[PDB]
Design an enzyme around this catalytic site. Structure first.
Site, PDB file in Angstrom:
ATOM      1  N   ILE A 148      42.339  50.349  39.542  1.00 61.90           N
ATOM      2  CA  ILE A 148      41.224  49.488  39.944  1.00 61.90           C
ATOM      3  C   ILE A 148      41.320  48.974  41.360  1.00 61.90           C
ATOM      4  CG2 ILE A 148      40.160  47.193  39.688  1.00 61.90           C
ATOM      5  CD1 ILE A 148      40.801  47.432  36.652  1.00 61.90           C
ATOM      6  N   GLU A 165      44.180  46.741  44.411  1.00 65.70           N
ATOM      7  CA  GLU A 165      45.504  46.321  44.799  1.00 65.70           C
ATOM      8  C   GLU A 165      45.516  45.005  45.488  1.00 65.70           C
ATOM      9  OE1 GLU A 165      46.555  49.871  46.703  1.00 65.70           O
ATOM     10  OE2 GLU A 165      46.278  49.145  48.751  1.00 65.70           O
ATOM     11  N   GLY A 166      46.720  44.516  45.696  1.00 59.88           N
ATOM     12  CA  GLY A 166      46.926  43.266  46.349  1.00 59.88           C
ATOM     13  C   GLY A 166      48.190  43.316  47.161  1.00 59.88           C
ATOM     14  N   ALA A 167      48.552  42.174  47.704  1.00 59.91           N
ATOM     15  CA  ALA A 167      49.635  42.123  48.677  1.00 59.91           C
ATOM     16  C   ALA A 167      51.008  42.540  48.083  1.00 59.91           C
ATOM     17  CB  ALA A 167      49.705  40.727  49.286  1.00 59.91           C
ATOM     18  N   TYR A 168      51.205  42.316  46.795  1.00 62.03           N
ATOM     19  CA  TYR A 168      52.451  42.666  46.130  1.00 62.03           C
ATOM     20  C   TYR A 168      52.186  43.218  44.724  1.00 62.03           C
ATOM     21  CZ  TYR A 168      51.643  37.836  44.762  1.00 62.03           C
ATOM     22  OH  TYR A 168      51.016  36.677  44.347  1.00 62.03           O
ATOM     23  N   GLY A 169      51.104  43.987  44.586  1.00 61.89           N
ATOM     24  CA  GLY A 169      50.874  44.727  43.373  1.00 61.89           C
ATOM     25  C   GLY A 169      49.618  45.568  43.285  1.00 61.89           C
ATOM     26  N   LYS A 190      47.321  43.771  35.607  1.00 60.06           N
ATOM     27  CA  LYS A 190      47.732  43.535  36.964  1.00 60.06           C
ATOM     28  C   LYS A 190      49.248  43.530  37.012  1.00 60.06           C
ATOM     29  CE  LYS A 190      47.413  39.615  40.140  1.00 60.06           C
ATOM     30  NZ  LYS A 190      46.469  38.519  40.472  1.00 60.06           N
ATOM     31  N   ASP A 246      40.451  31.178  47.845  1.00 59.67           N
ATOM     32  CA  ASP A 246      40.171  32.524  48.388  1.00 59.67           C
ATOM     33  C   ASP A 246      38.912  33.109  47.766  1.00 59.67           C
ATOM     34  OD1 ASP A 246      40.665  34.618  50.225  1.00 59.67           O
ATOM     35  OD2 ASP A 246      42.265  35.501  49.033  1.00 59.67           O
TER      36      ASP A 246
HETATM   37  C1  LIG Z   1      41.223  41.231  36.255  1.00 60.39           C
HETATM   38  C2  LIG Z   1      40.246  42.347  36.514  1.00 60.39           C
HETATM   39  C3  LIG Z   1      39.431  42.862  35.518  1.00 60.39           C
HETATM   40  N1  LIG Z   1      38.515  43.807  35.672  1.00 60.39           N
HETATM   41  C4  LIG Z   1      38.370  44.286  36.923  1.00 60.39           C
HETATM   42  N2  LIG Z   1      37.614  45.356  37.134  1.00 60.39           N
HETATM   43  C5  LIG Z   1      37.163  46.007  38.288  1.00 60.39           C
HETATM   44  C6  LIG Z   1      37.000  45.321  39.495  1.00 60.39           C
HETATM   45  C7  LIG Z   1      36.575  45.979  40.637  1.00 60.39           C
HETATM   46  C8  LIG Z   1      36.330  47.318  40.560  1.00 60.39           C
HETATM   47  F1  LIG Z   1      36.052  48.000  41.712  1.00 60.39           F
HETATM   48  C9  LIG Z   1      36.414  48.021  39.393  1.00 60.39           C
HETATM   49  C10 LIG Z   1      36.817  47.351  38.256  1.00 60.39           C
HETATM   50 CL1  LIG Z   1      37.035  48.269  36.784  1.00 60.39          CL
HETATM   51  N3  LIG Z   1      39.090  43.921  37.970  1.00 60.39           N
HETATM   52  C11 LIG Z   1      40.016  42.973  37.799  1.00 60.39           C
HETATM   53  C12 LIG Z   1      40.648  42.491  39.028  1.00 60.39           C
HETATM   54  C13 LIG Z   1      40.189  42.709  40.320  1.00 60.39           C
HETATM   55  N4  LIG Z   1      40.989  42.105  41.198  1.00 60.39           N
HETATM   56  C14 LIG Z   1      42.028  41.527  40.510  1.00 60.39           C
HETATM   57  C15 LIG Z   1      43.071  40.811  41.229  1.00 60.39           C
HETATM   58  O1  LIG Z   1      43.678  39.893  40.715  1.00 60.39           O
HETATM   59  N5  LIG Z   1      43.268  41.164  42.558  1.00 60.39           N
HETATM   60  C16 LIG Z   1      44.257  40.563  43.436  1.00 60.39           C
HETATM   61  C17 LIG Z   1      43.780  40.722  44.871  1.00 60.39           C
HETATM   62  O2  LIG Z   1      42.521  40.052  45.043  1.00 60.39           O
HETATM   63  C18 LIG Z   1      45.630  41.217  43.304  1.00 60.39           C
HETATM   64  C19 LIG Z   1      45.767  42.467  42.742  1.00 60.39           C
HETATM   65  C20 LIG Z   1      47.029  43.042  42.594  1.00 60.39           C
HETATM   66  C21 LIG Z   1      48.151  42.367  43.027  1.00 60.39           C
HETATM   67  C22 LIG Z   1      47.992  41.140  43.639  1.00 60.39           C
HETATM   68 CL2  LIG Z   1      49.341  40.368  44.372  1.00 60.39          CL
HETATM   69  C23 LIG Z   1      46.745  40.550  43.761  1.00 60.39           C
HETATM   70  C24 LIG Z   1      41.753  41.716  39.173  1.00 60.39           C
END
Ligand SMILES: Cc1cnc(Nc2ccc(F)cc2Cl)nc1-c1c[nH]c(C(=O)N[C@H](CO)c2cccc(Cl)c2)c1
Ligand SMILES: [Cl-]
Ligand SMILES: [Cl-]
EC number: 2.7.11.24
Length: 348
Positions: A21, A23-27, A44, A139
């Protein structure tokens, strides 16, 4: 164990068949099939343990989201990590799966006024809850607003969230800030650490502008240029507003700029509902003390079709961290994360 774009996701056998789906700064976040509940979910993966700051953010997000319950806020349904603190390198946070986010939606679609209004309502309904716990998101931006095809909206990514602290909001001119540039209130660059609720209201105003127009309203190229783009619309701050800025380097910077006119909102947004533009004006107020508050924004005429305090839950009481996380070592914070996630372990 499954792998997605170079990240191993050691989440089986309960969760299988992963797709990327984001990414983020550390995952990394993937979708997955939950073999227990027979539904797809979001997982996540975070890998924070080598950095003090990432561990602090991880603990805050977890603590806050485990406490919160609200329709417009993402929750945490499960947490996976290793049985012992030595083997723990990663944490997997399992969440309800959404379809897309507002960043992606706005790349492809111009929203109707009715969709803009409903999405704004939900953002503020969620924010009303967050703020009623004396929590700040810090944010808010389109990519942190999750959507489905029925236009349900959830706020996600509480990694920068913290308890409001107005007494320690003050800082010097040009202080480093972590939250996304384009959504930073002007005071971040002048005198603020973003420890008050007004910081989030500015970000929501920026999001509203973007829903109206499919353009970021203040696309600064760099830290200080961000302030200059804000002033490019708002115009030079009034004397009253300037007098509120005590720290001299900030004040002298503003005094050094050429005079800038206030650009009328209808020039930017010629087809917008006038009431939306009135609300936008109040959210994008230079002086944070004069900026509209979350309940006041919900009560604004633009949202009259929706505003209904009898269907807008609030938190029981202010959220409270048991200890000061700011100065704890990353190995101490790891111990705390281990403890916080223990109740999701088999047994417990
Ligand atoms: C909890 C969740 C649940 N459903 C969806 N779906 C989704 C969201 C966007 C899409 F382009 C496609 C889909 Cl399927 N996205 C999420 C989600 C999107 N962002 C995050 C999320 O928490 N993103 C943050 C960065 O902002 C993140 C990510 C990885 C590691 C770190 Cl350190 C931080 C969760
Ligand atoms: Cl700069
Ligand atoms: Cl000041």
């Amino acid at each position: 164990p499954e792998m997605v774009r170079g990240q191993v996701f050691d989440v089986g056998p309960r969760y299988t068949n992963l797709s990327y789906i984001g990414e983020g700064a550390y995952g990394m976040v993937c979708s997955a099939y939950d073999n227990v509940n027979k539904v797809r979910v979001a997982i996540k993966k975070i890998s924070p343990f080598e950095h003090q700051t990432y561990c602090q953010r991880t603990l805050r997000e977890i603590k806050i989201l485990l406490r919160f319950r609200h329709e417009n806020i993402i929750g945490i349904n499960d947490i996976i990590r290793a049985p012992t603190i030595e083997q723990m390198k990663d944490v997997y946070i399992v969440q309800d799966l959404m379809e897309t986010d507002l960043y992606k939606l706005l790349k492809t679609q111009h929203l109707s006024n009715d969709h803009i209004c409903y999405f704004l309502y939900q953002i503020l309904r969620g924010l009303k809850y967050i703020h009623s716990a004396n929590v700040l998101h810090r944010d808010l931006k389109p990519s942190n607003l999750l959507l489905n095809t029925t236009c349900d909206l959830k706020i996600c990514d509480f990694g920068l969230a913290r308890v409001a602290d107005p007494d320690h909001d003050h800082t010097g001119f040009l202080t480093e800030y972590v939250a996304t540039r384009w959504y930073r209130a002007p005071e971040i660059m002048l005198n603020s650490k973003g420890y008050t609720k007004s910081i989030d209201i500015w970000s929501v105003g920026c999001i509203l502008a973007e829903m109206l127009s499919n353009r970021p309203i203040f696309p600064g190229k760099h830290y200080l240029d961000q302030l200059n783009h804000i002033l490019g619309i708002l115009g030079s701050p009034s004397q009253e507003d300037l007098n509120c800025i005590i720290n001299l380097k900030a004040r002298n910077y503003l005094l050094s700029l050429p005079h800038k006119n206030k650009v009328p909102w209808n020039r930017l947004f010629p087809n917008a509902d006038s009431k939306a533009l009135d609300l936008l004006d109040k959210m994008l107020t230079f002086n944070p003390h004069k900026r509209i508050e979350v309940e006041q924004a919900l009560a604004h005429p633009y949202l009259e079709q929706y505003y209904d305090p009898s269907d807008e839950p609030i938190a029981e009481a202010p959220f409270k961290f048991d200890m000061e996380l700011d100065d704890l070592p990353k190995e101490k914070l790891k111990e705390l994360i281990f403890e916080e996630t223990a109740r999701f372990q088999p047994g417990y």
